[PDB]
């Protein structure tokens, strides 16, 4: 319906301008004589930029070796996190940790940070010990005992950092940090370490007679 409107308006204006009035002079204006092939050729290479970008980065990642097949990857700027299964010239395929596929233009990789935890040395452990303002006295001996517990712990890479320190206050909690690594990289082993650690911690706290700290409040009634 609307192209009828466009064509009818153009046909109306032209036929009226050339029947009511009629052109004494002659204009040489050809809608189709314009040889300017050049325009579409020009337009070819511009139009296809994502694909062109993909082949370049595919080549480079075929030479540059950020990651390899079967390596756990993550990105900190995009939700791109799994294991490589394949490369392509333009895009790769990842199995997510949902055992699901992920198809990805590689041109993305050119301007984005990239991480390979499957290349890493070790895994990390951190926690925060919510302790009560009541328990302020015993903090140093708790921490020190705690540091010793980790230092006598086998699964740790003692040559990596080991930090046990009351770093900050908080709302109704006195938060001691933890920062320890494992000389393993096996997820399950790391978690077993984490578990036994937390348990030994709790043993230590409750052995010192102090207690952890929920959120807390102070009320005035009426």
Site mask for a copy of itself (CB under 8 A), range 112-141, x = bound: xxxxxx-xxxxxx--xxxx--x--x--xx-
Looking from the CA of 162 toward its CB, the CA atoms found within 13 Å total 18
**Interactions with a copy of itself, residue window 181-200 (CB under 8 A):** 181, 187-188, 191-192, 194-195, 198-199
Find out whether 175 and 168 touch, Cβ atoms under 8 Å. Answer: yes
Find out whether 79 and 97 touch, Cβ atoms under 8 Å. Answer: no
Find out whether 95 and 101 touch, Cβ atoms under 8 Å. Answer: yes
**Interactions with a copy of itself, residue window 141-160 (CB under 8 A):** 143, 160
If the CB atoms of residues 15 and 112 are measured against a copy of itself, the closer one turns out to be 112
CA quadruple 73, 75, 81, 87: dihedral sign: negative
Q: What number of chain residues touch a copy of itself (CB under 8 A)?
A: 109
**Interactions with a copy of itself, residue window 5-44 (CB under 8 A):** 6, 34, 36-44
70 binds a copy of itself (CB under 8 A): no
204 binds a copy of itself (CB under 8 A): no
77 binds a copy of itself (CB under 8 A): yes
> Minimum distance between the CB of residue 21 and a copy of itself, rounded to whole angstroms?
18
> Minimum distance between the CB of residue 22 and a copy of itself, rounded to whole angstroms?
20
Q: Which of 92, 94, 50 is nearest to 73 (CA)?
A: 94
Q: Which of 182, 126, 128, 194 is nearest to 154 (CA)?
A: 182
């Amino acid at each position: 319906x609307x192209x009828x409107x466009x064509x009818x308006x153009x046909x109306x204006x032209x036929x009226x301008x050339x029947x009511x009035x009629x052109x004494x002079x002659x204009x040489x204006x050809x809608x189709x004589x314009x040889x300017x092939g050049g325009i579409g050729g020009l337009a070819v290479g511009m139009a296809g930029k994502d694909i062109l970008s993909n082949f370049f980065s595919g080549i480079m990642l075929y030479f540059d070796r950020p990651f390899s097949i079967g390596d756990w990857i993550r990105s900190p700027d995009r939700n791109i996190e799994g294991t490589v299964a394949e490369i392509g010239w333009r895009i790769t395929k990842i199995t997510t940790f949902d055992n699901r596929p992920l198809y990805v233009p590689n041109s993305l990789f050119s301007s984005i940070s990239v991480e390979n935890p499957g290349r890493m040395t070790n895994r990390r452990i951190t926690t925060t010990i919510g302790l009560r303002y009541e328990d302020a006295a015993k903090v140093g001996v708790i921490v020190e005992a705690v540091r010793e517990m980790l230092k006598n712990h086998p699964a740790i890479d003692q040559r990596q950092t080991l930090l046990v320190y009351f770093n900050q206050f908080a709302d109704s909690s006195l938060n001691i940090m933890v920062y320890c690594f494992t000389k393993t990289t096996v997820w399950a082993e790391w978690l077993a370490a984490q578990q036994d650690v937390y348990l030994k911690i709790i043993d230590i706290v409750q052995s010192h007679g102090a207690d952890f700290a929920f959120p807390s409040q102070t009320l005035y009634m009426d």
